[PDB]
Design a protein around this motif. Structure first.
Motif, PDB file in Angstrom:
ATOM      1  N   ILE A  32      21.913 -66.414  68.889  1.00  0.00           N
ATOM      2  CA  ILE A  32      23.193 -65.975  70.035  1.00  0.00           C
ATOM      3  C   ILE A  32      23.964 -66.768  70.141  1.00  0.00           C
ATOM      4  O   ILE A  32      25.009 -65.584  70.441  1.00  0.00           O
ATOM      5  CB  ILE A  32      22.232 -66.187  70.566  1.00  0.00           C
ATOM      6  CG1 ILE A  32      20.320 -65.394  70.668  1.00  0.00           C
ATOM      7  CG2 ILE A  32      22.198 -65.210  72.825  1.00  0.00           C
ATOM      8  CD1 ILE A  32      19.056 -66.365  71.676  1.00  0.00           C
ATOM      9  N   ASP A 251      10.272 -68.322  85.141  1.00  0.00           N
ATOM     10  CA  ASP A 251      10.700 -66.659  85.002  1.00  0.00           C
ATOM     11  C   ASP A 251       9.885 -65.427  83.727  1.00  0.00           C
ATOM     12  O   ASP A 251      10.918 -64.900  83.711  1.00  0.00           O
ATOM     13  CB  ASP A 251      11.850 -66.443  85.483  1.00  0.00           C
ATOM     14  N   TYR A 254      10.815 -59.669  82.781  1.00  0.00           N
ATOM     15  CA  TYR A 254      12.275 -58.413  82.047  1.00  0.00           C
ATOM     16  C   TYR A 254      13.320 -59.416  81.786  1.00  0.00           C
ATOM     17  O   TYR A 254      14.242 -59.412  81.324  1.00  0.00           O
ATOM     18  CB  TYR A 254      12.379 -56.616  82.824  1.00  0.00           C
ATOM     19  CG  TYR A 254      13.164 -56.058  81.554  1.00  0.00           C
ATOM     20  CD1 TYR A 254      14.680 -55.841  82.364  1.00  0.00           C
ATOM     21  CD2 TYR A 254      12.454 -55.782  80.969  1.00  0.00           C
ATOM     22  CE1 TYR A 254      15.170 -55.052  82.273  1.00  0.00           C
ATOM     23  CE2 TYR A 254      13.112 -54.583  79.982  1.00  0.00           C
ATOM     24  CZ  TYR A 254      14.479 -54.581  80.580  1.00  0.00           C
ATOM     25  OH  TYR A 254      15.039 -53.495  79.735  1.00  0.00           O
ATOM     26  N   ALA A 255      13.630 -59.809  83.501  1.00  0.00           N
ATOM     27  CA  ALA A 255      15.147 -60.798  84.107  1.00  0.00           C
ATOM     28  C   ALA A 255      16.226 -59.944  83.312  1.00  0.00           C
ATOM     29  O   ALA A 255      16.851 -60.714  82.494  1.00  0.00           O
ATOM     30  CB  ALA A 255      14.656 -62.033  83.584  1.00  0.00           C
ATOM     31  N   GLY A 256      16.528 -58.930  82.975  1.00  0.00           N
ATOM     32  CA  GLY A 256      17.846 -58.267  82.637  1.00  0.00           C
ATOM     33  C   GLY A 256      18.380 -57.170  83.681  1.00  0.00           C
ATOM     34  O   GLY A 256      19.389 -56.930  83.547  1.00  0.00           O
ATOM     35  N   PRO A 257      23.198 -42.328  79.519  1.00  0.00           N
ATOM     36  CA  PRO A 257      23.535 -42.730  80.514  1.00  0.00           C
ATOM     37  C   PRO A 257      22.407 -42.839  81.982  1.00  0.00           C
ATOM     38  O   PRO A 257      21.490 -41.679  82.133  1.00  0.00           O
ATOM     39  CB  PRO A 257      24.065 -41.376  81.142  1.00  0.00           C
ATOM     40  CG  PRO A 257      24.464 -40.057  80.492  1.00  0.00           C
ATOM     41  CD  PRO A 257      23.869 -40.725  79.019  1.00  0.00           C
ATOM     42  N   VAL A 258      22.599 -43.865  82.657  1.00  0.00           N
ATOM     43  CA  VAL A 258      21.572 -43.499  83.528  1.00  0.00           C
ATOM     44  C   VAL A 258      21.967 -44.126  85.432  1.00  0.00           C
ATOM     45  O   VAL A 258      23.225 -45.354  84.532  1.00  0.00           O
ATOM     46  CB  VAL A 258      20.058 -44.015  82.944  1.00  0.00           C
ATOM     47  CG1 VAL A 258      20.952 -45.755  83.047  1.00  0.00           C
ATOM     48  CG2 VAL A 258      19.243 -44.084  84.390  1.00  0.00           C
ATOM     49  N   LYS A 259      21.729 -44.189  85.697  1.00  0.00           N
ATOM     50  CA  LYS A 259      22.709 -44.248  87.335  1.00  0.00           C
ATOM     51  C   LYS A 259      21.851 -45.755  87.770  1.00  0.00           C
ATOM     52  O   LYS A 259      20.838 -46.069  87.602  1.00  0.00           O
ATOM     53  CB  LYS A 259      22.732 -43.748  88.751  1.00  0.00           C
ATOM     54  CG  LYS A 259      23.941 -43.995  89.806  1.00  0.00           C
ATOM     55  CD  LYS A 259      23.321 -42.847  91.089  1.00  0.00           C
ATOM     56  CE  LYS A 259      23.873 -41.469  91.296  1.00  0.00           C
ATOM     57  NZ  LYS A 259      25.022 -41.562  91.478  1.00  0.00           N
ATOM     58  N   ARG A 260      23.108 -47.032  88.047  1.00  0.00           N
ATOM     59  CA  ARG A 260      22.451 -48.453  88.835  1.00  0.00           C
ATOM     60  C   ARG A 260      22.896 -48.487  90.086  1.00  0.00           C
ATOM     61  O   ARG A 260      24.347 -48.194  89.864  1.00  0.00           O
ATOM     62  CB  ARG A 260      21.664 -49.265  87.719  1.00  0.00           C
ATOM     63  CG  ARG A 260      22.177 -49.164  86.597  1.00  0.00           C
ATOM     64  CD  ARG A 260      22.373 -50.072  86.455  1.00  0.00           C
ATOM     65  NE  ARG A 260      22.121 -51.586  86.538  1.00  0.00           N
ATOM     66  CZ  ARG A 260      21.566 -52.845  86.289  1.00  0.00           C
ATOM     67  NH1 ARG A 260      21.620 -53.147  84.722  1.00  0.00           N
ATOM     68  NH2 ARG A 260      21.310 -54.198  86.982  1.00  0.00           N
ATOM     69  N   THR A 261      22.757 -49.880  90.812  1.00  0.00           N
ATOM     70  CA  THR A 261      24.436 -49.873  92.061  1.00  0.00           C
ATOM     71  C   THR A 261      24.724 -51.250  91.098  1.00  0.00           C
ATOM     72  O   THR A 261      24.282 -52.226  90.207  1.00  0.00           O
ATOM     73  CB  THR A 261      22.772 -50.904  93.322  1.00  0.00           C
ATOM     74  OG1 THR A 261      22.301 -51.231  92.729  1.00  0.00           O
ATOM     75  CG2 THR A 261      22.445 -49.411  93.995  1.00  0.00           C
ATOM     76  N   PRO A 262      26.115 -51.289  91.678  1.00  0.00           N
ATOM     77  CA  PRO A 262      26.425 -52.280  91.761  1.00  0.00           C
ATOM     78  C   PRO A 262      26.242 -54.034  91.893  1.00  0.00           C
ATOM     79  O   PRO A 262      26.017 -53.669  93.116  1.00  0.00           O
ATOM     80  CB  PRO A 262      28.216 -52.604  91.597  1.00  0.00           C
ATOM     81  CG  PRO A 262      28.286 -51.342  93.271  1.00  0.00           C
ATOM     82  CD  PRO A 262      26.664 -50.722  92.892  1.00  0.00           C
ATOM     83  N   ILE A 263      27.180 -54.497  91.279  1.00  0.00           N
ATOM     84  CA  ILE A 263      26.423 -56.176  91.539  1.00  0.00           C
ATOM     85  C   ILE A 263      27.791 -57.485  90.953  1.00  0.00           C
ATOM     86  O   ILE A 263      28.172 -56.213  90.485  1.00  0.00           O
ATOM     87  CB  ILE A 263      25.073 -57.106  90.911  1.00  0.00           C
ATOM     88  CG1 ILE A 263      24.949 -56.554  89.831  1.00  0.00           C
ATOM     89  CG2 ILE A 263      24.131 -55.910  92.112  1.00  0.00           C
ATOM     90  CD1 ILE A 263      23.673 -57.016  89.623  1.00  0.00           C
ATOM     91  N   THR A 264      27.560 -58.483  91.615  1.00  0.00           N
ATOM     92  CA  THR A 264      29.329 -59.386  91.367  1.00  0.00           C
ATOM     93  C   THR A 264      28.194 -60.973  91.341  1.00  0.00           C
ATOM     94  O   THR A 264      27.526 -61.075  92.623  1.00  0.00           O
ATOM     95  CB  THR A 264      29.659 -59.200  92.219  1.00  0.00           C
ATOM     96  OG1 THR A 264      30.450 -57.698  92.109  1.00  0.00           O
ATOM     97  CG2 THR A 264      31.308 -60.062  91.852  1.00  0.00           C
ATOM     98  N   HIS A 265      27.676 -61.552  89.913  1.00  0.00           N
ATOM     99  CA  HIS A 265      27.258 -62.847  89.802  1.00  0.00           C
ATOM    100  C   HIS A 265      28.123 -63.463  89.691  1.00  0.00           C
ATOM    101  O   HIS A 265      28.372 -63.001  88.271  1.00  0.00           O
ATOM    102  CB  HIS A 265      25.718 -62.562  88.872  1.00  0.00           C
ATOM    103  CG  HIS A 265      24.820 -61.911  89.908  1.00  0.00           C
ATOM    104  ND1 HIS A 265      23.294 -62.288  90.347  1.00  0.00           N
ATOM    105  CD2 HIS A 265      24.103 -60.547  90.386  1.00  0.00           C
ATOM    106  CE1 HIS A 265      22.265 -61.795  90.720  1.00  0.00           C
ATOM    107  NE2 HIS A 265      23.374 -60.422  91.189  1.00  0.00           N
ATOM    108  N   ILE A 266      28.165 -64.643  89.659  1.00  0.00           N
ATOM    109  CA  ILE A 266      29.379 -65.269  89.421  1.00  0.00           C
ATOM    110  C   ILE A 266      27.728 -66.882  89.543  1.00  0.00           C
ATOM    111  O   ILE A 266      27.580 -67.006  90.554  1.00  0.00           O
ATOM    112  CB  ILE A 266      30.462 -66.221  90.392  1.00  0.00           C
ATOM    113  CG1 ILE A 266      30.116 -66.460  91.807  1.00  0.00           C
ATOM    114  CG2 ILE A 266      31.877 -64.560  90.399  1.00  0.00           C
ATOM    115  CD1 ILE A 266      31.605 -66.121  92.401  1.00  0.00           C
TER     116      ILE A 266
ATOM    117  N   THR D  27      30.158 -61.985  85.489  1.00  0.00           N
ATOM    118  CA  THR D  27      29.215 -61.007  85.485  1.00  0.00           C
ATOM    119  C   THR D  27      29.076 -60.158  86.865  1.00  0.00           C
ATOM    120  O   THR D  27      28.872 -60.239  87.482  1.00  0.00           O
ATOM    121  CB  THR D  27      27.891 -61.345  84.586  1.00  0.00           C
ATOM    122  OG1 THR D  27      27.155 -61.904  86.541  1.00  0.00           O
ATOM    123  CG2 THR D  27      28.042 -62.914  84.000  1.00  0.00           C
ATOM    124  N   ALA D  29      28.230 -55.537  87.756  1.00  0.00           N
ATOM    125  CA  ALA D  29      27.868 -54.745  87.874  1.00  0.00           C
ATOM    126  C   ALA D  29      28.771 -53.175  87.826  1.00  0.00           C
ATOM    127  O   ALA D  29      28.831 -52.810  89.165  1.00  0.00           O
ATOM    128  CB  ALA D  29      26.575 -54.210  87.339  1.00  0.00           C
TER     129      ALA D  29
END
Ligand code: ZN
Ligand code: ZN
Ligand code: ZN
Ligand code: ZN
Ligand code: ZN
Ligand code: ZN
Ligand code: ZN
Lengths: 397, 365, 395, 367
Positions: A32, A251, A254-256, A257-266, D27, D29
């Protein structure tokens, strides 16, 4: 140690380890991320960037330019006939326009004396030249005191004959010849706050399943803490103690064309105990009284009152009959009897448990009538009834 | 005879939440001459209230719980034995029975033993420490607040086979009636030796001295049952000496007693089946469930509401219940369904609630 | 017709008098008390009270919070159980003075018709009707009580005068001899009735596709009967004869396993008669972290180990159908079909193991087991389970 | 199912381990997945500096939006930062590749799934349409030296070259200034040479890297043609510092290095990627660094100076020495990635499962 919990000790530590036994093979064959690049585990790296100063990618072609500036060890063997010997390569060529016969040329490589009843080296001496003129190439092995060929090299520069020894025939114009070619930690397990096993590590810091050779304990504690995180690792220097414990809040998900909403993780910029309740009352159960006074045994009083009021509701039964009926019901319910032979003891318990009650109510006659009634069903012997009623009238008299 | 009651609407308050009220109760345990006080309740809003001669209902206290989804049903008043303070007792849909001390204005005590909503709460009249609680979980309960533990469970296999809607002691505090949706008016008893020594052991309970649980004395066998006095749901029941008064969705109160007319109340067997309908009171427009009636301390009269607003009042001192003179009270503004009414210690003040968050008042003259 | 209006009025005025003096003594008791009045805080959310009538101002007051409390799920009333349940001449006392004569067959009528064989009780909660009347059938001053006693005694003993003389005591051997000289002149188990005829196609045992037991009064030398096992070990494996079929161990027949030993102790070899002896695990109730209530287990168990047994009211198929149709509104279906004849309904009665829930990944499971003909449930373990863990099994 | 479970479990392990490897992690999306990502040269610097990004979209039953976004990078201090979308431009169909002009950074060319590709200019806001191909593709590239010159490719066996400087402003559609066709299969990459505008390079699925000269007036013969790999060749990239050296990435699970002075000899073949490679880019701030990524869900980066060096046995068990880093933060096919031209060792990388990571390796790794 029973087998069940000991197998649970295996099984509880099997299924997290079994996925790690799978991820071990997956991470070795498909890593990995490189383990050398970790900051907490950085001793694995053993080089610096000194060479980049004098390096030049324009000069890289000059570096590989100066780089740009089979060893058939056909050893002879003992002959079989009735001394010196020599091998030779026979080249066959293609049919050209001018010449009609194939060119023939016998190139003897080298001789070697061997007994009967040495070696010869050939370091890539095909000499075909790749000019569309080498149709085939044989290898002869002669003897004396006995000559033949064997297809060693194939048409497409492939190996025809295998390694090891061999033999061949011969034909002049019996004799033959042979040849031989050559091309300390301590996993203190603790589950449910129980010492199911206490071991001592074989090696000092070789991980138990990942099997990496780290020369520091802080790297091992962080690797087991970070990587392979189905357990919670806590360790204290005490020869070194490692307290393994299953992570019951991991935990796993699952923990992880097609539509989905955006996000912002830092993430980085600059680095049993639950309460209980009673069964019938539903009041909170104190921790002091958990094992003592185990409810659901000592069957309830409403069943006894039901057995009372049901047979009391019966019309065509007399008073003393209903009395001895409720006495027998309370007796059999106070001590359950499944086996039929134990009923022979049950009457001997009855006079020993309620005999004084029937004397105080004048119920001996209907008691003997009940005894004869159960005797009709072949539950007990008649001499046992004689013994029981004699004992009853002895204590009553 | 004439009405002998000069009733007139002195006040009609309206709260600022617009949620139907479910109960109202006066502080009957208060002494004489002090400023009187009562308390109403909505879904998640209990409100104490004063009352004066000029209709000045001075707002005293108003508590609200954090969880808004709770639905309060009933209230009651009690006095403490040692501290000699008031104590409001409340409950709701969360399965909780809270005890509010209005002087300190805190939730000094709370009990939880039910699965679903509480329908009505009652207190034993002579001994003020016991506390009966009726619930939708096909069973009643009896607690003791002095020792903070449960006393008994008046329910079981022989209990009600549906939701239990109401219950009530007698005036002496030796026998309890209970009614619900199961078309059953079941009797209990708190006078036998079992309940007496159970209460006495509950008084002597202490979890710090010993280390044991409480031996809850369940009661899986009431002393009298019947399923012929009514057909529809039985929303409320009360005692009058040794007579049972009961209502239903049939729009008629019934006064009766177990067994024949000559049969005594204190000698009824479990297998007794016969009854005797002594009298009835007629009215109309009471189809909606969860309706109540009430009486004073002396029980000289009776009050009742309907699903339109025109409340009714009946006498009890006069003879001939089935020929008793009724009385009506109306107004050109009570456009809502009344749920419960209540009186003070004396019969002077009457206060009633409704489904439009309205609180009506009446007074003698 | 109407001869009780005056009596009703008399009872009503007596009611008024007694409730009046009761209220009087209650008022005398209440007057002794002296309680303090209410006292308000001086006037965060707000609450305002208006007034429809003029002349009264709007009264405001600040709100006050209350302490929260841990909510629990919903549970209807119930009661515990350990055994199953089912819901659908005078002959005076022998010791009494008014006894009268009666023959042997007529004297023991109530005793023989009310007694039950399969449980050793009278009018139990799973045997509604006795099998047949033929099951108990077999091949000086003299009061009626003494006459009936001598009759049944001579019937069971068949004229053994010394034994009756020992038992009665009052009557002597010569008197009893002279008196006898001057007296001669996937279906539920069901016991069938065919003593003369053999076990054939007409018998309902072969129709039910089940093996007979000890309780049937057929030929002891028959083949349809189920003899006990001959296993010395715990015989909790597939090699056992009883574990092949759904049946459990037998107390009398299975002598080799050691089921007839004393039941006072608990360490026994036979690890299959736990339903008869009742060696269940001490379960506990708790709020589940999945849906409502749940059951926890105290001690660890093994694979295919005995946890507990289900209990409830035995009822017919159509009865449970209408009951489940009634339960469709509440959406609480704790039913459990047993077999074609009877089925379990444990909503009103049961035990702790009823409080388990359904899951796609089970660890326990259920099994129908014919203990002495009684088709009981057995809740066994499909996996080694720890303490304080949730229990699930597919219905 | 179990494979994606294992992949996301490894992603959880990476999320646990990531605060010991990178100096920065971000990261993000998007509303739709993006087959294109590119840093822009403009920058604004008011503790965090603002940088800009161009991103594509791949929609279905919804209008496409070519995104001009921004990002907040800490420079050498500080815990704050977020992604913000500045401008969105409607687009004809999906997007396969897009490129900005190095001379005029405002002009941005984009491809379509149809023939007519287009070119936008966000300062004025198709601003300039372009045609000549008969099918979709992936190739597009502006010239660095000469303004207006633009190369494009497609799988219909054509390589179009336009020069938009000649047309007036009124003319929006422009025919091909020339069409090159020498391959015999689906050509899969073309790219201009950086420091010499008079030639370019390409790779096709004939097992052929082909170098073309611009001065020659023959649109069929390449300047050179070499069999580079055993299987289909996918992509290529020229070096920013040097001029002769270049790199290729093929579907035989290899990256390789070549030179424009002797194109016959393969200098070195890097092999750690275990699937088809789809993008390789040289770093702007470093010369001896290369990058690669594909559908293997792990972005590899190599150091050329560390080639052929001896190391420890336990260090050699992990992998070869030249392999510098393997950023396995994604959870799907790595669709594209790009470097920033004004920050050290930081990159952005966009995947197909709506994952747009931005990260910089630790200083202790490369030093
Ligand atoms: Zn029975
Ligand atoms: Zn049979
Ligand atoms: Zn038979
Ligand atoms: Zn039979
Ligand atoms: Zn057995
Ligand atoms: Zn057995
Ligand atoms: Zn056995």
């Amino acid at each position: 140690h029973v087998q069940a919990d000991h197998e649970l000790f295996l099984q509880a530590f099997e299924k997290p380890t079994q996925i790690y036994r799978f991820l071990r093979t997956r991470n070795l064959i498909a890593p990995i991320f490189l383990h050398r690049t970790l900051t907490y585990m950085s001793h694995r790296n053993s080089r610096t960037n000194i060479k980049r100063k004098t390096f030049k990618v324009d000069d890289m072609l000059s570096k590989v330019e100066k780089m740009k500036g089979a060893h058939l060890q056909l050893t002879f063997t003992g002959f079989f006939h009735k001394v010196t010997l020599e091998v030779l390569l026979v080249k066959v060529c293609h049919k050209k326009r001018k010449d009609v016969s194939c060119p023939i040329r016998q190139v003897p490589t080298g001789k070697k004396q061997v007994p009967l009843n040495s070696l010869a080296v050939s370091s890539n001496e095909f000499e075909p030249s790749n000019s569309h003129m080498v149709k085939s190439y044989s290898l002869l092995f002669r003897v004396t005191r006995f000559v033949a060929q064997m297809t060693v090299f194939d048409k497409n520069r492939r190996l025809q004959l295998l390694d090891g020894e061999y033999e061949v025939a011969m034909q002049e114009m019996g004799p033959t010849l042979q040849f031989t070619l050559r091309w300390r930690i301590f996993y203190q397990f603790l589950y449910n706050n129980n010492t199911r096993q206490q071991t001592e590590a074989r090696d000092d810091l070789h991980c138990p399943w990942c099997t990496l050779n780290c020369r520091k304990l802080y790297s091992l504690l962080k690797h087991l803490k970070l990587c392979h995180s189905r357990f919670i690792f806590n360790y204290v220097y005490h020869p070194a103690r490692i307290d393994v414990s299953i992570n019951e809040c991991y935990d796993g998900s699952y923990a992880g064309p097609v539509k989905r909403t955006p996000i912002t993780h830092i993430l980085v910029c600059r680095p049993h105990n639950r309460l209980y309740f009673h069964s019938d009352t539903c009041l909170p159960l104190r921790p002091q009284e958990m094992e003592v006074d185990s409810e659901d045994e000592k069957d309830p009083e409403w069943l006894r009152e039901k057995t009372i009021t049901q047979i009391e509701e019966f019309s065509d039964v007399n008073e003393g009959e209903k009395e001895v009926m409720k006495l027998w019901n309370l007796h059999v319910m106070k001590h359950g009897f499944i086996a039929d032979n134990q009923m022979n003891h049950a009457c001997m318990l009855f006079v020993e448990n309620y005999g004084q009650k029937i004397i105080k109510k004048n119920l001996c006659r209907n008691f003997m009538l009940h005894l004869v009634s159960m005797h009709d069903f072949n539950l007990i012997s008649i001499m046992s009834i004689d013994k029981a009623v004699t004992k009853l009238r002895e204590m009553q008299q | 005879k004439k009405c002998k009651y000069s009733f007139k609407c002195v006040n009609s308050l309206k709260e600022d939440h617009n949620q139907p009220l479910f109960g109202v109760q006066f502080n009957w345990h208060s002494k004489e001459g002090d400023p009187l006080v009562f308390a109403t309740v909505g879904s998640n809003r209990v409100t104490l209230y004063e009352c004066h001669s000029q209709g000045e209902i001075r707002l005293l206290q108003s508590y609200v719980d954090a969880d808004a989804d709770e639905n309060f049903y009933t209230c009651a008043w009690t006095y403490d034995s040692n501290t000699s303070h008031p104590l409001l007792a409340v409950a709701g849909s969360r399965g909780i029975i809270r005890i509010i001390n209005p002087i300190t204005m805190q939730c000094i005590k709370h009990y939880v033993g039910h699965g679903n909503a509480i329908n009505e709460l009652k207190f034993h009249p002579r001994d003020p420490n016991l506390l009966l609680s009726v619930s939708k979980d096909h069973a009643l309960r009896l607690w003791n607040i002095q020792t903070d533990t449960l006393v008994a469970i008046f329910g079981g296999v022989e209990g009600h086979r549906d939701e239990v809607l109401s219950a009530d002691y007698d005036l002496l505090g030796e026998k309890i009636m209970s009614c619900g949706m199961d078309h059953s008016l079941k009797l209990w008893r708190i006078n036998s030796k079992r309940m007496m020594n159970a209460i006495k052991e509950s008084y002597d309970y202490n979890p710090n001295k010993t280390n044991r649980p409480f031996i809850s004395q369940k009661i899986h066998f009431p002393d009298f049952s019947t399923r012929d006095i009514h057909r529809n749901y039985v929303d409320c029941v009360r005692w009058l000496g040794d007579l049972i008064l009961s209502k239903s969705c049939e729009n008629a109160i019934v006064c009766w007693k177990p067994g024949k007319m000559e049969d005594d109340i204190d000698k009824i067997k479990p297998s007794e089946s016969n009854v005797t309908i002594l009298g009835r009171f007629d009215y109309s427009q009471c189809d909606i469930w969860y309706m109540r009636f009430s009486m004073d301390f002396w029980q000289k009269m009776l009050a009742l509401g309907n699903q339109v607003g025109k409340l009714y009042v009946w006498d009890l001192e006069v003879e001939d219940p089935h020929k008793a003179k009724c009385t009506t009270l109306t107004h050109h503004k009570c456009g809502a369904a009344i749920r419960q009414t209540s009186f003070s210690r004396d019969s002077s003040i009457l206060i009633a609630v409704c489904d439009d968050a309205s609180i009506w008042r009446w007074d003698r003259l | 017709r109407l001869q009780a209006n005056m009596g009703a009025k008399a009872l009503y005025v007596a009611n008024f008098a007694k409730v009046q003096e009761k209220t009087q003594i209650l008022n005398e008791e209440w007057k002794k008390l002296r309680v303090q009045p209410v006292q308000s805080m001086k006037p965060l959310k707000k609450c305002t009270i208006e007034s429809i009538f003029p002349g009264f101002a709007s009264q405001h007051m600040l709100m006050r919070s209350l302490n929260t409390v841990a909510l629990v799920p919903i549970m209807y009333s119930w009661s515990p159980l350990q055994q199953n349940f089912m819901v659908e001449q005078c002959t005076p006392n022998i010791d009494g003075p008014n006894a009268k004569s009666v023959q042997r067959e007529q004297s023991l009528h109530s005793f023989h018709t009310l007694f039950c064989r399969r449980c050793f009780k009278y009018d139990c909660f799973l045997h509604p009707f006795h099998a047949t009347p033929n099951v108990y059938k077999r091949k000086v001053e003299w009061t009626g009580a003494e006459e009936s006693l001598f009759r049944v005694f001579h019937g069971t003993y068949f004229n053994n005068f010394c034994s009756i003389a020992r038992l009665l005591g009052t009557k002597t051997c010569k008197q009893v001899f002279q008196f006898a000289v001057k007296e001669s002149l996937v279906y539920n188990y069901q016991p069938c009735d065919h003593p003369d005829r053999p076990c054939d196609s007409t018998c309902p045992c072969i129709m039910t596709q089940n093996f007979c037991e000890k309780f049937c009064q057929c030929n002891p030398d028959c083949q349809n009967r189920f003899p006990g096992c001959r296993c010395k070990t715990q015989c909790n494996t597939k090699q056992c004869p009883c574990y092949l079929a759904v049946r459990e161990c037998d107390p009398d027949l299975c002598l080799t396993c050691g089921a007839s030993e004393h039941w006072d102790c608990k360490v026994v070899s036979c690890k299959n008669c736990s339903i008869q002896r009742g060696l269940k695990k001490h379960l506990l109730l708790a709020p589940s972290d999945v849906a409502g209530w749940g059951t926890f287990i105290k001690e660890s168990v093994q694979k295919n180990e005995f946890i507990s047994e289900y209990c409830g009211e035995l009822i017919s198929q159509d009865e449970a159908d209408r009951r489940g149709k009634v339960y469709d509104k509440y959406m609480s279906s704790f039913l459990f079909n047993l077999n074609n004849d009877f089925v379990v309904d444990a909503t009103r009665k049961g035990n702790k193991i009823r409080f388990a829930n359904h899951s796609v990944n089970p660890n326990c499971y259920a099994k129908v087991v014919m203990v002495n003909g009684d088709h009981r449930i057995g809740i066994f373990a499909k996996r080694a389970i720890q303490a304080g863990e949730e229990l699930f099994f597919d219905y | 199912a179990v494979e994606e479970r294992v992949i996301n479990e490894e992603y959880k392990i990476w999320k646990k381990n990531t605060p010991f490897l990178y100096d920065l992690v971000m990261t993000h999306a998007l509303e739709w997945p993006s087959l294109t990502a590119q840093w822009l040269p403009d920058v604004t610097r008011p503790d965090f500096s603002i940088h800009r990004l161009v991103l594509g979209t791949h929609t279905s039953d919804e209008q496409n939006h070519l995104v001009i976004a921004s990002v907040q990078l800490p420079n050498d201090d500080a815990v704050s930062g977020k992604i913000e979308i500045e401008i969105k431009i409607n687009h004809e169909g999906e997007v396969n590749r897009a490129r900005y002009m190095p001379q005029n950074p405002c002009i941005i060319a984009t491809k379509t799934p149809s023939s007519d590709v287009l070119v936008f200019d966000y300062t004025k806001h198709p601003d300039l349409r372009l045609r000549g191909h008969q099918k979709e593709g992936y190739g597009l590239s502006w010239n660095p030296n000469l303004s207006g010159h633009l190369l494009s490719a497609s799988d219909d066996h054509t390589i179009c070259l336009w020069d938009i400087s000649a047309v007036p402003k009124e003319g929006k559609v422009v025919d091909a200034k020339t069409i090159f066709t020498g391959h015999t299969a689906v050509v899969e990459d073309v790219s201009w040479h950086l420091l010499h505008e008079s030639l370019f390079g390409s790779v096709a699925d004939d097992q052929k890297l082909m170098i073309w000269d611009t001065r020659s007036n023959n649109t069929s013969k390449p300047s050179h043609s070499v069999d580079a790999h055993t299987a289909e060749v996918n992509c290529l990239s020229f070096n920013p510092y040097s001029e002769f050296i270049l790199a290729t990435g093929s579907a035989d699970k290899t990256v390789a290095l070549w030179d424009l002075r002797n194109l016959k000899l393969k200098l070195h073949s890097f092999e750690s990627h275990k699937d088809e490679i789809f993008q390789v880019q040289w770093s702007p701030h470093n010369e001896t660094i290369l990058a690669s990524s594909g559908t293997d869900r792990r972005l590899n980066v190599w150091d050329l100076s560390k080639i052929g060096e001896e190391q420890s046995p336990e260090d050699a068990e992990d992998g070869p020495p030249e392999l510098l880093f393997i950023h396995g933060g994604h959870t799907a096919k790595i669709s594209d990635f790009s470097w920033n031209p004004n920050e050290p060792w930081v990159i952005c990388s966009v995947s197909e499962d709506n994952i747009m990571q931005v990260w910089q390796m630790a200083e202790n790794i490369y030093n």
